Amino acid sequence: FEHATTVPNVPGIPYKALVERAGYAPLNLEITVVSSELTPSTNKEYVTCKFHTVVPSPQVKCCGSLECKASSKADYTCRVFGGVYPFMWGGAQCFCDSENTQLSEAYVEFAPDCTIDHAVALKVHTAALKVGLRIVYGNTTARLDTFVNGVTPGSSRDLKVIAGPISAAFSPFDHKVVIRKGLVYNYDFPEYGAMNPGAFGDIQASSLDATDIVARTDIRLLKPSVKNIHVPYTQAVSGYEMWKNNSGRPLQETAPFGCKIEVEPLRATNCAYGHIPISIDIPDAAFVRSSESPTILEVSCTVADCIYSADFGGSLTLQYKANREGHCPVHSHSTTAVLKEATTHVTATGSITLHFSTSSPQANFIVSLCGKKTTCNAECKPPADHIIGEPHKVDQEFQAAVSKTSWNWLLALFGGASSLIVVGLIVLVCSSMLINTRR
Amino acid sequence: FEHATTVPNVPGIPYKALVERAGYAPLNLEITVVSSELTPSTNKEYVTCKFHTVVPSPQVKCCGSLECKASSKADYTCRVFGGVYPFMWGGAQCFCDSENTQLSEAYVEFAPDCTIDHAVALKVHTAALKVGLRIVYGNTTARLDTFVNGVTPGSSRDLKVIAGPISAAFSPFDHKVVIRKGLVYNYDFPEYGAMNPGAFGDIQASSLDATDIVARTDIRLLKPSVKNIHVPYTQAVSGYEMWKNNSGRPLQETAPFGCKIEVEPLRATNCAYGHIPISIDIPDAAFVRSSESPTILEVSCTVADCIYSADFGGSLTLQYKANREGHCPVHSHSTTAVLKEATTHVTATGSITLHFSTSSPQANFIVSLCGKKTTCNAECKPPADHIIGEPHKVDQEFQAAVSKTSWNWLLALFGGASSLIVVGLIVLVCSSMLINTRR
Numbered sequence A, B: 001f002e003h004a005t006t007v008p009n010v011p012g013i014p015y016k017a018l019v020e021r022a023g024y025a026p027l028n029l030e031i032t033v034v035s036s037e038l039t040p041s042t043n044k045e046y047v048t049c050k051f052h053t054v055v056p057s058p059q060v061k062c063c064g065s066l067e068c069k070a071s072s073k074a075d076y077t078c079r080v081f082g083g084v085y086p087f088m089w090g091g092a093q094c095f096c097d098s099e100n101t102q103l104s105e106a107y108v109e110f111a112p113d114c115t116i117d118h119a120v121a122l123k124v125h126t127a128a129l130k131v132g133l134r135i136v137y138g139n140t141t142a143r144l145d146t147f148v149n150g151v152t153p154g155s156s157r158d159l160k161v162i163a164g165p166i167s168a169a170f171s172p173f174d175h176k177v178v179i180r181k182g183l184v185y186n187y188d189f190p191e192y193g194a195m196n197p198g199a200f201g202d203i204q205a206s207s208l209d210a211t212d213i214v215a216r217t218d219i220r221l222l223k224p225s226v227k228n229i230h231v232p233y234t235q236a237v238s239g240y241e242m243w244k245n246n247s248g249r250p251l252q253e254t255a256p257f258g259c260k261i262e263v264e265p266l267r268a269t270n271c272a273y274g275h276i277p278i279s280i281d282i283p284d285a286a287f288v289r290s291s292e293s294p295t296i297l298e299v300s301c302t303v304a305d306c307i308y309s310a311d312f313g314g315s316l317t318l319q320y321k322a323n324r325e326g327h328c329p330v331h332s333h334s335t336t337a338v339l340k341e342a343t344t345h346v347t348a349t350g351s352i353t354l355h356f357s358t359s360s361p362q363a364n365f366i367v368s369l370c371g372k373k374t375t376c377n378a379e380c381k382p383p384a385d386h387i388i389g390e391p392h393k394v395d396q397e398f399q400a401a402v403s404k405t406s407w408n409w410l411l412a413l414f415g416g417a418s419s420l421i422v423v424g425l426i427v428l429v430c431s432s433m434l435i436n437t438r439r
Helices: A239-245 A404-437 B239-245 B404-437
Strands: A002-008 A015-019 A027-048 A051-054 A077-081 A102-110 A119-137 A140-147 A153-156 A159-163 A176-180 A183-185 A219-221 A233-235 A260-262 A267-269 A275-281 A296-303 A314-322 A330-332 A337-339 A349-358 A364-369 A372-377 B002-008 B015-019 B027-039 B042-048 B051-054 B074-081 B102-110 B119-124 B128-137 B140-147 B153-156 B159-163 B176-180 B183-185 B219-221 B233-235 B260-262 B267-269 B275-281 B298-306 B314-321 B330-332 B337-339 B349-358 B362-369 B372-379
Touching (some): B102 B219, B337 B362
Antiparallel strands (some): A002 A275, A015 A027, A119 A176, A219 A233, B002 B275, B159 B275, B337 B349
16 A cells, blocks of 8 residues: 655654555555765766975086976976086096086875875765664654655565655755865865866876876976986975865855765765655555554543643644544644654543643644544643754744634724625625716 | 967967067967867666577476576576476476476576677766867977867977967767767666666667676566467567667767767767867977067058959068068967968068958958068958868857948948937027027
């Protein structure tokens, strides 16, 4: 027996519904979203870190001329200079004080520590949502995990559930996302090869040990100006460091809907937004024919004091008359009221005290015991506390979130003018009839 | 000096342009798109192949009772059957032929040969274009590889190139692709977990060696009937096999715009479509002032036979007066006329033959030698040959393919009506004023 519902996507808040197969006693259905992770499609474009500026030992052609070669080393740097007359520790290193050409060579690799202190730049796309569900039906509880797409099923030995697609699409991640040690930053990283020196991604590679590093650090060599041999050079500051200093706040503190961002794989857990449509085919063994569960002859509702709040602040009493002692389910058929208890033992005749929560100023909601209806009418005061450590269990509507007294006043002041204009039109018509008759 | 052009994206076709510096001799420029590689971004959803339906050895309780345990094997299935009293080779493999509970167990895994014959399912995202360019300017040539985005430059010792963005974006891949042994199919596949028996991806896993194999092959056990012990079962055919039989032709044979679909990594090579804006900053040493190169005094153009075929089916001669021997460049300043040669040695007095191609029935193109211009006017015949194994080097422009004769006839036929209606309006005005005077 297939039942379709729209469970609100709010972790930790059970949603209760009543399935009513025609020939069978009603059954209670409690659906709880235990966990939900939204994971996007991700693909590594490259990784980056602080370059180590490696400067090979110089070579000198003592009485000739060298020619700069071409190398694929990340930002390979080469420059030839004229007479240098370098001093090594002895006091001379070349005769031919003129025509003493020198070559200065330099490039950039990954620093040894970059194996862990590195960032990975990954582009994302549409994210599928995966939900962990605990479902309790009647007296049986089952747990399931499913993809909320409207096609992917899940099964637990007899339970058979299809969820999705999500009513509203949403992803907390930007098209471009940067990961560093588990901190997520939605920084717009530069494109592969679009490397600007002094900014994030000044060097790039497809892996930490990869040999095809591409670098552009804006490195320029200088003519050696001191007698002793060494190679002067300047270089833009490590753009990796600049991004580190100016990183802003990580996404773990910026994602809306309070979703905890985790890595490996990058994913958002408990991301509470919208509703998911769920169809459940309950196995036929759970239902029981109406002759066995005790039907109730009549029920009357008396509501005590109530306050509309997130906690179960309202209470009521049901006077019931039944035909056998049993375990009837109890439900609220209104959208703006939910019950703490879903199933109570019932005797031949008695009263049951039950607790509930609502969100409207007045409770005007239909309770149902074993399918028999009763319109509970009551009046809930505004709450006392300002702040609770528990989320609201019911959405706030408009057509019901207006007090009947306020409704009466509003209707009176809106209908007075309507009655007046009706009377004015009536008087005009009567005057027209009189003037027509008496012309 | 930065010069910007719009090279047509047609691999193998040189494009000739002329850099005209303000005060310096003109210099020839030639751009060749040696190769192009549009490569998308891929993520491995899963890999699928023929499943192997492994049936573990059955277990029999003599006349007790077993129970079916949950497992995690792919499409794990278990059933319990009653009295069996099986036979193996003695004829009684259990005493007490009552409640002879027999457990049947079955699941699937990857066949041993799936390590080679297997399809990887990919989702592709926005694809970046990379091109290898050979550029020769004046006498000096260079090759480089650049990414067509408008930001990433290419550097070759003196050449600074800016490529992109693409004029008209295009990706031959659909949203979902399947790779098998280098054959590419743009066939959408069910998402992870969404197994359908008898259809593609009926068995899925993240890798060939992954133990987290998930499957839904719709395998059902049957009660054994013949007294010899054996477990019967029935199962839908391998959806992988069904997709292989009806795969259709691969993309390497149906990709539009005529490009080679390549794998490892997936990419499309040499796909001609649209245009690339390219800016070249020519190094200042390549230029020379016009005082060095000879400047010709007068040049005139006599067009020979011309045919607007796709090849160099046209010839002409330039008679020139010049001041000194040199190596003047030659260019065509029209978008419907290209020249086989771009430079020539020039004497003081004489004439030179040259070759050219066009596509309009007329030639009305401006040749130039060492900067000074000269019109060439001609009528070209339709090509005698029907088919050539060369692409058209130019494109027929909007209403530029109207012949002179057609232009004359069309203007005459419209001008007749124009003059007629003008005469009618003039005669009406004259009649009106004549009557008004004599009214």
